[PDB]
Amino acid sequence: CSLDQTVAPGNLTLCGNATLFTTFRPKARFIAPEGWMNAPMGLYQRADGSIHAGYQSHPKHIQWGNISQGAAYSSDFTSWTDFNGSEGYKTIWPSQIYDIRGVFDGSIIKEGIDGYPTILYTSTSFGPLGATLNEAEGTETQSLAYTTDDGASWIKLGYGAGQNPVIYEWPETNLTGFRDPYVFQSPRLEALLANTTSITNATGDHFATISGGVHGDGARLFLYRQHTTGEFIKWTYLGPLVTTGYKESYGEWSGNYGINFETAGVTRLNPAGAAWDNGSDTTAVDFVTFGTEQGRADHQNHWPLWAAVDYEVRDNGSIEAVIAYSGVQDWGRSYAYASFPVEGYRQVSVGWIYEDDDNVILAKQFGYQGAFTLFRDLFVKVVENVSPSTPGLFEQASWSTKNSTDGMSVTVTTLGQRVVPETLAAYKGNSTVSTLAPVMLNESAAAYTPFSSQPTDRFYALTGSFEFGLNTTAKAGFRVLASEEEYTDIWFDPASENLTVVRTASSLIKSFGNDTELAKVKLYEIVGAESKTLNLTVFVDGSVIEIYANDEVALSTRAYPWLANSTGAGLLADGTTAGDVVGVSGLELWDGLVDAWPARPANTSQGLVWDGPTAAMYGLFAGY
Amino acid sequence: CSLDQTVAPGNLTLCGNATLFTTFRPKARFIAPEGWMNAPMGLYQRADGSIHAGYQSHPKHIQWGNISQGAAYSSDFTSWTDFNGSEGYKTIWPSQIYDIRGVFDGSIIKEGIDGYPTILYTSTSFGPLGATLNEAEGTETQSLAYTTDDGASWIKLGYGAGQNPVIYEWPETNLTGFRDPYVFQSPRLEALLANTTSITNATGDHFATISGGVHGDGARLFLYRQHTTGEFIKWTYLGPLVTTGYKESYGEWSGNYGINFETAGVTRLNPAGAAWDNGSDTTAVDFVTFGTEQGRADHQNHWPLWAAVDYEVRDNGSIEAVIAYSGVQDWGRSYAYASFPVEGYRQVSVGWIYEDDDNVILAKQFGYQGAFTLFRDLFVKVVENVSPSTPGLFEQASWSTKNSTDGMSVTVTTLGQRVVPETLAAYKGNSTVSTLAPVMLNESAAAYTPFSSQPTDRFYALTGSFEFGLNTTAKAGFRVLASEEEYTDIWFDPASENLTVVRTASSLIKSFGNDTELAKVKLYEIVGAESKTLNLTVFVDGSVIEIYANDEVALSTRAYPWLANSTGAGLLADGTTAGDVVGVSGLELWDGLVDAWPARPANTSQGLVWDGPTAAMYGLFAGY
Numbered sequence A, B: 001c002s003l004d005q006t007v008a009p010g011n012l013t014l015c016g017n018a019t020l021f022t023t024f025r026p027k028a029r030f031i032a033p034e035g036w037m038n039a040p041m042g043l044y045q046r047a048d049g050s051i052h053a054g055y056q057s058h059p060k061h062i063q064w065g066n067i068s069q070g071a072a073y074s075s076d077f078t079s080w081t082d083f084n085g086s087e088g089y090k091t092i093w094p095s096q097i098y099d100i101r102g103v104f105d106g107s108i109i110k111e112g113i114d115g116y117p118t119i120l121y122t123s124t125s126f127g128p129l130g131a132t133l134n135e136a137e138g139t140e141t142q143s144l145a146y147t148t149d150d151g152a153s154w155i156k157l158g159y160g161a162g163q164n165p166v167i168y169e170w171p172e173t174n175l176t177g178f179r180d181p182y183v184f185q186s187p188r189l190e191a192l193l194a195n196t197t198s199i200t201n202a203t204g205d206h207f208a209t210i211s212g213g214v215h216g217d218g219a220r221l222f223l224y225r226q227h228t229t230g231e232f233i234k235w236t237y238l239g240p241l242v243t244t245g246y247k248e249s250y251g252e253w254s255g256n257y258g259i260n261f262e263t264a265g266v267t268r269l270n271p272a273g274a275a276w277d278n279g280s281d282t283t284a285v286d287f288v289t290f291g292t293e294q295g296r297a298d299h300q301n302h303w304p305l306w307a308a309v310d311y312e313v314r315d316n317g318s319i320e321a322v323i324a325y326s327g328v329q330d331w332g333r334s335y336a337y338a339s340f341p342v343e344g345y346r347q348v349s350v351g352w353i354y355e356d357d358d359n360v361i362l363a364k365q366f367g368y369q370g371a372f373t374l375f376r377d378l379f380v381k382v383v384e385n386v387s388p389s390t391p392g393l394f395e396q397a398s399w400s401t402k403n404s405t406d407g408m409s410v411t412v413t414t415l416g417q418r419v420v421p422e423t424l425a426a427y428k429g430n431s432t433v434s435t436l437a438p439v440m441l442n443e444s445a446a447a448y449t450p451f452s453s454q455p456t457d458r459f460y461a462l463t464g465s466f467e468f469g470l471n472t473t474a475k476a477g478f479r480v481l482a483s484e485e486e487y488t489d490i491w492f493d494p495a496s497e498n499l500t501v502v503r504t505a506s507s508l509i510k511s512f513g514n515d516t517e518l519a520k521v522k523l524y525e526i527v528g529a530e531s532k533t534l535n536l537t538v539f540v541d542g543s544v545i546e547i548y549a550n551d552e553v554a555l556s557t558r559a560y561p562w563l564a565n566s567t568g569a570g571l572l573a574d575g576t577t578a579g580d581v582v583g584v585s586g587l588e589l590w591d592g593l594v595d596a597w598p599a600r601p602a603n604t605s606q607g608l609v610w611d612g613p614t615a616a617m618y619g620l621f622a623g624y
């Protein structure tokens, strides 16, 4: 195995385990020390203000299995430290008949058992498990554990009657899934249900959703309410909160609802961030975020979605969440978004970015799989004075519109997402920052124009504001991770409303994914403006390319160029002319970002292991 | 619930959990502190000379499940002390995917991993498990753990390739079972295989048998050999050691071989005890002990058997154990005999005595189930100068015969069993001993004649030698646990050769078993004698009645009389006349025996618990 990145790549499948550990590896974001990771879990802000982040983890393997909670903490979402205990960086693992098949996703009750932070998680046991299989009751249950040492360790309740698991009965027959309990407080839901509590007897201050669906009949989000305040064993099923149809789609801006939900959460937001009012705040909007499966031809059959909802109270003392409008949380190779409350009226969301090596060709050579997205503040994005002539505006697909009294302008409301300011500040302050002169793209514009300052490695951020004519047919954007022979092109095409990432040339290594990524972006045209603007922020972090547009649209993807000098960046231009010009301003390169794991050495591999011939006998885990 | 034992029993099913804890409970033998126990396991003599005894254990339940090793130790087989650690008296429990369904029986490698005592045990996982079900490979595997603190705790090898489980591949298809690894050293087997080791490459000093069978085709004992001395991961399958037919029986003296073996062991004995020669000792005999299932209409479908075997070497470098003669280790309500080596050339055997409450009517009220037998020295019983006119002598069913040169006498060889002398000495020395005058049973003999001294409680031993005429039709024996209305009758009937325990009147409580127990006993008649003698030793210990005849025949059973004064004992006589007399001598009562668990209070119940509705969902354990 040759690791010469000045010449074409050889046959990299001949390379040893973890020989490509550092080659494509993110440095500026949350990632496990080694091995397999997937969904974020157990997220909470601790008593000292620091952030505890858990994740689905399988150390010393590069496929899923024996799934456990790995964990770390940070005071700023940005620089992290691993927990280190008797099981390394794991803090919860399969150990009991009820969870031996995997400690799946869970969420935090901050004041739980004996006043301690408490996780409610999906405890899995034996049997077929999956939305396309014939799962039975008991295979997925919900269990509690609590921590007396701020997340260094967790103590499970005992196995048995009146103890773990605490939720085991299926609320309906023939479920496609029954997992990912999301526990939350809600003055809103409490006020709505206050007149019906004699019907159900559930009066606790915590609610919990469980994600799933019904065979042949679409996805379901099931709502439970803690039966009694201060008591954590009894959870009363109220009813289905969200009910969608079998592979139902709200349209081109909304993905597809698939057959089964995963990692669903419930929040309430206003323009500033999180809202904890009882309904009295007329600027607040109720949201559900959720993954769907088997409604997509690619991206591992997975859509990470969100919906604004209007709650209705049922006669049986339950809640129907009626979808008002419906969007996409990230359009690329990410999934399993979790959100959690943060002090100062914030709700922060983070997901998992999978690799683009679906045939598992170089996973062993990597010695790891997966990373997080950046941490994102959620809020209600409000755009004022929108022109009624904005194309497609009254479809109200993933936004709402409200006319002015005179009908000459519109207020647009949608879900806002932006990178947490702590990370933006730390990234910029630790980088070599180059503020670039504005560039007018016209008839003289080359297809690709390198920036006047260049990155020095695969760890950088770009900002730019692209001003387009209202009837443009020009395309513009950013090329990143670029040499002569390898590059990744990020294009926006206002005429089609499509933001694309073209990866046909991303790498000389042919085994990685190369499909074109696509997001829809609505440029809301402002009354009196003679142009429309796209504000792009792009993070390049090893192999991760994470794109944010207008504090609204996110697209995470992967690129794995082999050559050491495929690190360049610049402007892309297509169909720009003397008449159809694209004005680029607010241009900035942040070279270096932050070393997110300062205590870790460059290579944190501990080698890879095989479970042996029993893995195929048990049939639960791949075994490697 | 009334506990008045001076009047007839009420409806005892109304009694609370463990309200009958002390009522019927043995005091003088090995028993768990509370809850369910079954098979002995992990038996070894520790470096300090003390005995470590493990047992299959399910605390705070009265049916089998989550099966674990409970443990205790003793310096004399008789007075015991519990281990106490983080899991109470447990020292190995289900904790890994490979053993989460139960830590089944295992045996000890005294110099194992890093020189420490090491257990090889059956690690069970999910799936149908049983001789009458369709079991698959992986459900039962064999795994290692070792102890650095003389049995207070055990450390399992890791899960994976080249680690646990160490034996997982089925040696043939469609096994009825694959469990109970019995590890042993054998100079005998080493010498037999020494010329064939190039064929298999297995040259280690430890052998292991695994108990099972083949669907439709009878039981099997599979032989493995440690591949390399001092290395414990690799065990090479040689071949089947014992092969028997589907419900094959060697006859009336030999039980039935059923469909599947359990808890099989291999030993070599001579007249003094254990033999460790390479074949050169012409007085030594090779034995296998084993349980069989589904060859019996009652006694939980279970026979605890033994066979003398002659080893033949196969061309493929394996061993066939050809059965020479075949007997019964205990004729009553016991099973799962384990044997282990003890210093001074001894092999000691101990089994499990189950209750006689098969419909589980009063188990919760007991708050426990099960005890051990007494510990027994095994040896080759040799009877010299046997008369050729002994009825049935040349059937050679569960014994061998060798004629003298002149044909006028015979030497009989069989398996000997006797209670370990440490226990006999301790019992006698701690008891109030009454030496009773000989009693001649003739025409004046009543049906029942109380002993001149009586027991004071349900903890005593009786000895007696019964001298019968060679053509007698009289019956005699012992009545125990006797008042006017409740009693248990132990009869021997030389004409039929049957030792019986009649339990039609054992208790006023009708829910307990009342079937007549039966053992065959051959009184080998001595040349020149005008009579034949039965030496009986009987232990009464709470509800256990354990009978030994002529250091050969054992019969364990249960009796649960309600009345406080059902403690008496005496002689039984039937058909004794002036001409057909039974001379009883060597009569002795030992009243009290030994307090076997001096540190335990009278009531060691910790209550009983229910696993809850998930027990039926998982389908592995009853749940209570």
Ligand SMILES: *[C@@H]1O[C@H](CO)[C@@H](O[C@@H]2O[C@H](CO)[C@@H](O[C@@H]3O[C@H](CO[C@H]4O[C@H](CO[C@H]5O[C@H](CO)[C@@H](O)[C@H](O)[C@@H]5O[C@H]5O[C@H](CO)[C@@H](O)[C@H](O)[C@@H]5O)[C@@H](O)[C@H](O[C@H]5O[C@H](CO)[C@@H](O)[C@H](O)[C@@H]5O)[C@@H]4O)[C@@H](O)[C@H](O[C@H]4O[C@H](CO)[C@@H](O)[C@H](O)[C@@H]4O[C@H]4O[C@H](CO)[C@@H](O)[C@H](O)[C@@H]4O[C@H]4O[C@H](CO)[C@@H](O)[C@H](O)[C@@H]4O)[C@@H]3O)[C@H](O)[C@H]2NC(C)=O)[C@H](O)[C@H]1NC(C)=O
Pocket (backbone or CB within 6 Å): A092, A093, A095, A096, A097, A113, A114, A154, A155, A156, A157, A158, A159, B066, B068, B085, B086, B087, B090, B093, B094
């Ligand atoms: C099959 O068999 C399995 C094995 O038996 C079985 O699993 C076991 O289940 C039992 C029963 O559920 C579990 O027992 C519980 O344990 C909890 C503690 O768990 C943590 O700590 C233990 C012990 O840790 C010691 O030992 C280990 C090992 O050596 C060390 O590593 C530790 O450092 C520690 O060492 C010290 O102590 C030792 C002695 O104990 C010393 O020897 C040593 O020198 C040290 O000083 C760990 O073993 C646990 O690890 C395991 O589990 C974790 C997950 O939790 C895994 O990640 C890990 O890998 C291991 O598998 C773990 O870390 C106890 O809290 C719990 O006791 C409470 O509940 C019971 C039942 O309800 C009560 O009776 C009891 O009174 C306790 O409740 C009180 O306390 C809590 C809070 O403290 C209150 O919330 C509660 O209301 C109550 O309060 C009472 O007291 C108050 C006074 O303060 C009073 O105010 C109140 O009014 C009230 O009275 C219970 O003991 C056991 O852990 C499992 N073991 C394993 C290995 O899995 C399995 O379930 C079975 N399966 C089936 C299908 O049946």
Ligand SMILES: *[C@@H]1O[C@H](CO)[C@@H](O[C@@H]2O[C@H](CO)[C@@H](O[C@@H]3O[C@H](CO[C@H]4O[C@H](CO[C@H]5O[C@H](CO)[C@@H](O)[C@H](O)[C@@H]5O[C@H]5O[C@H](CO)[C@@H](O)[C@H](O)[C@@H]5O)[C@@H](O)[C@H](O[C@H]5O[C@H](CO)[C@@H](O)[C@H](O)[C@@H]5O)[C@@H]4O)[C@@H](O)[C@H](O[C@H]4O[C@H](CO)[C@@H](O)[C@H](O)[C@@H]4O[C@H]4O[C@H](CO)[C@@H](O)[C@H](O)[C@@H]4O[C@H]4O[C@H](CO)[C@@H](O)[C@H](O)[C@@H]4O)[C@@H]3O)[C@H](O)[C@H]2NC(C)=O)[C@H](O)[C@H]1NC(C)=O
Pocket (backbone or CB within 6 Å): A066, A068, A085, A086, A087, A090, A093, A094, B092, B093, B095, B096, B097, B113, B114, B154, B155, B156, B157, B158, B159
């Ligand atoms: C799914 O995930 C699961 C969780 O990850 C996973 O289970 C885990 O598997 C791993 C991998 O197999 C297990 O790790 C092994 O652990 C063995 C020790 O096990 C005992 O001790 C641990 C740790 O005990 C500490 O912590 C607990 C908990 O707090 C305390 O109770 C203890 O008191 C103790 O505390 C002290 O130390 C702590 C830090 O560790 C401190 O924080 C603390 O303050 C104290 O000071 C226990 O947790 C174990 O309990 C569990 O398991 C038992 C059964 O064993 C259960 O009954 C119980 O309920 C628990 O479940 C247990 O008691 C290690 O020995 C082992 O390490 C050896 O092997 C590895 C791999 O081969 C080697 O890399 C390593 O070097 C070690 O080998 C060397 O040493 C041995 C002998 O010591 C030699 O034989 C060997 O040749 C080698 O020698 C080397 O060193 C020599 C120098 O001396 C040199 O001469 C040689 O040349 C050579 O170099 C390994 O770490 C882990 O225990 C499992 N955990 C659990 C909870 O189950 C599961 O498998 C996964 N499932 C699937 C399907 O994938």
Ligand SMILES: *[C@@H]1O[C@H](CO)[C@@H](O[C@@H]2O[C@H](CO)[C@@H](O[C@@H]3O[C@H](CO[C@H]4O[C@H](CO)[C@@H](O)[C@H](O[C@H]5O[C@H](CO)[C@@H](O)[C@H](O)[C@@H]5O)[C@@H]4O)[C@@H](O)[C@H](O[C@H]4O[C@H](CO)[C@@H](O)[C@H](O)[C@@H]4O[C@H]4O[C@H](CO)[C@@H](O)[C@H](O)[C@@H]4O)[C@@H]3O)[C@H](O)[C@H]2NC(C)=O)[C@H](O)[C@H]1NC(C)=O
Pocket (backbone or CB within 6 Å): A161, A162, A163, B017, B364, B607, B608, B609, B610, B612, B613, B622, B624
């Ligand atoms: C004395 O010891 C016992 C442990 O042995 C302790 O716990 C009790 O254990 C018994 C089993 O021995 C449990 O009985 C079973 O209960 C089932 C119904 O449970 C629900 O109702 C009861 C009664 O109101 C409630 O107390 C339970 O509440 C507890 O459990 C829930 C979880 O569900 C917790 O949230 C609570 O906090 C409590 O812990 C329940 O709400 C019942 O289905 C089951 O019935 C089967 O068995 C009986 C008896 O054989 C039959 O009559 C019946 O027809 C069913 O038969 C089954 O038989 C076979 C084999 O199982 C199957 O194949 C059949 O199809 C059929 O299903 C049983 O009665 C009891 O619930 C439990 N009590 C607890 C935990 O409180 C006692 O506590 C202990 N006492 C003391 C004072 O310490």
Ligand SMILES: *[C@@H]1O[C@H](CO)[C@@H](O[C@@H]2O[C@H](CO)[C@@H](O[C@@H]3O[C@H](CO[C@H]4O[C@H](CO)[C@@H](O)[C@H](O[C@H]5O[C@H](CO)[C@@H](O)[C@H](O)[C@@H]5O)[C@@H]4O)[C@@H](O)[C@H](O[C@H]4O[C@H](CO)[C@@H](O)[C@H](O)[C@@H]4O[C@H]4O[C@H](CO)[C@@H](O)[C@H](O)[C@@H]4O)[C@@H]3O)[C@H](O)[C@H]2NC(C)=O)[C@H](O)[C@H]1NC(C)=O
Pocket (backbone or CB within 6 Å): A017, A364, A607, A608, A609, A610, A612, A613, A622, A624, B161, B162, B163
């Ligand atoms: C680098 O990391 C790996 C962990 O990823 C470490 O361990 C190796 O891991 C790989 C899997 O990634 C193992 O490969 C598998 O090996 C199977 C055959 O094993 C036996 O032969 C090999 C080769 O001589 C021996 O080394 C093994 O010895 C070890 O295991 C035994 C227990 O069996 C122990 O006793 C020893 O001590 C050793 O620990 C074995 O004797 C093989 O069956 C399996 O093949 C499948 O997969 C490949 C690749 O995809 C296919 O080509 C093949 O057709 C099979 O495909 C399967 O694919 C699907 C999904 O699984 C199924 O549905 C199909 O039906 C089909 O079965 C695979 O090749 C490797 O054995 C293991 N090596 C070990 C433990 O030594 C490396 O050690 C590590 N390297 C370093 C230097 O650290």
Ligand SMILES: *[C@@H]1O[C@H](CO)[C@@H](O[C@@H]2O[C@H](CO)[C@@H](O)[C@H](O)[C@H]2NC(C)=O)[C@H](O)[C@H]1NC(C)=O
Pocket (backbone or CB within 6 Å): B465, B533, B534, B535, B550, B551
């Ligand atoms: C019944 O027990 C008696 C008493 O132990 C046995 O007779 C004794 O046997 C020992 C050992 O061989 C001799 O040393 C004694 O001299 C014998 N005592 C006698 C005859 O009173 C007798 O062998 C046992 N019988 C059976 C059938 O097991």
Ligand SMILES: *[C@@H]1O[C@H](CO)[C@@H](O)[C@H](O)[C@H]1NC(C)=O
Pocket (backbone or CB within 6 Å): A011, A013, A014
């Ligand atoms: C790369 O090496 C593998 C062995 O890992 C081989 O099977 C494959 O065909 C090779 N690819 C080539 C020669 O293009």
Ligand SMILES: *[C@@H]1O[C@H](CO)[C@@H](O)[C@H](O)[C@H]1NC(C)=O
Pocket (backbone or CB within 6 Å): A237, A238, A239, A240, A314, A316, A318
């Ligand atoms: C309440 O009613 C809704 C709508 O019919 C139903 O889906 C839900 O299951 C009901 N809740 C119950 C039965 O607890």
Ligand SMILES: *[C@@H]1O[C@H](CO)[C@@H](O)[C@H](O)[C@H]1NC(C)=O
Pocket (backbone or CB within 6 Å): A388, A403, A407, A408
């Ligand atoms: C909103 O404004 C547009 C443009 O003025 C108009 O076509 C539409 O009918 C208005 N909707 C309402 C509800 O008044």
Ligand SMILES: *[C@@H]1O[C@H](CO)[C@@H](O)[C@H](O)[C@H]1NC(C)=O
Pocket (backbone or CB within 6 Å): A076, A078, A079, A425, A426, A427, A428, A429, A430, A594
């Ligand atoms: C660099 O990053 C660290 C870690 O996130 C941060 O705390 C620090 O403020 C940053 N340095 C700056 C902004 O100068």
Ligand SMILES: *[C@@H]1O[C@H](CO)[C@@H](O)[C@H](O)[C@H]1NC(C)=O
Pocket (backbone or CB within 6 Å): A005, A006, A007, A483, A484, A485, A563, A565, A566
């Ligand atoms: C980058 O490296 C390649 C391969 O070594 C080389 O051919 C090329 O000249 C270098 N520069 C660019 C911008 O491609």
Ligand SMILES: *[C@@H]1O[C@H](CO)[C@@H](O)[C@H](O)[C@H]1NC(C)=O
Pocket (backbone or CB within 6 Å): B011, B013, B014
């Ligand atoms: C004994 O009590 C049980 C309740 O535990 C009852 O069902 C049974 O019929 C009673 N037996 C009688 C009255 O003989």
Ligand SMILES: *[C@@H]1O[C@H](CO)[C@@H](O)[C@H](O)[C@H]1NC(C)=O
Pocket (backbone or CB within 6 Å): B237, B238, B239, B240, B314, B316, B318
């Ligand atoms: C050795 O031969 C015997 C008798 O045919 C057979 O049962 C056993 O399986 C063989 N051993 C092997 C194949 O290892």
Ligand SMILES: *[C@@H]1O[C@H](CO)[C@@H](O)[C@H](O)[C@H]1NC(C)=O
Pocket (backbone or CB within 6 Å): B388, B403, B407, B408
């Ligand atoms: C053994 O002795 C009996 C009685 O003398 C005789 O019938 C039988 O044939 C003898 N057996 C042998 C092998 O000599």
Ligand SMILES: *[C@@H]1O[C@H](CO)[C@@H](O)[C@H](O)[C@H]1NC(C)=O
Pocket (backbone or CB within 6 Å): B076, B078, B079, B425, B426, B427, B428, B429, B430, B594
């Ligand atoms: C009584 O029993 C104890 C415990 O087994 C034993 O050590 C002691 O020797 C016995 N006392 C005697 C024989 O006097």
Ligand SMILES: *[C@@H]1O[C@H](CO)[C@@H](O)[C@H](O)[C@H]1NC(C)=O
Pocket (backbone or CB within 6 Å): B005, B006, B007, B483, B484, B485, B563, B565, B566
């Ligand atoms: C034993 O107790 C019962 C019941 O109290 C009583 O009737 C009888 O007289 C007593 N004695 C005997 C030997 O049965």
Ligand SMILES: OC[C@H]1O[C@H](O)[C@H](O)[C@@H](O)[C@@H]1O
Pocket (backbone or CB within 6 Å): A312, A313, A314, A315, A316, A320
């Ligand atoms: O099914 C009963 C209830 O369900 C619906 O959610 C309606 O909002 C409510 O008006 C109705 O009474």
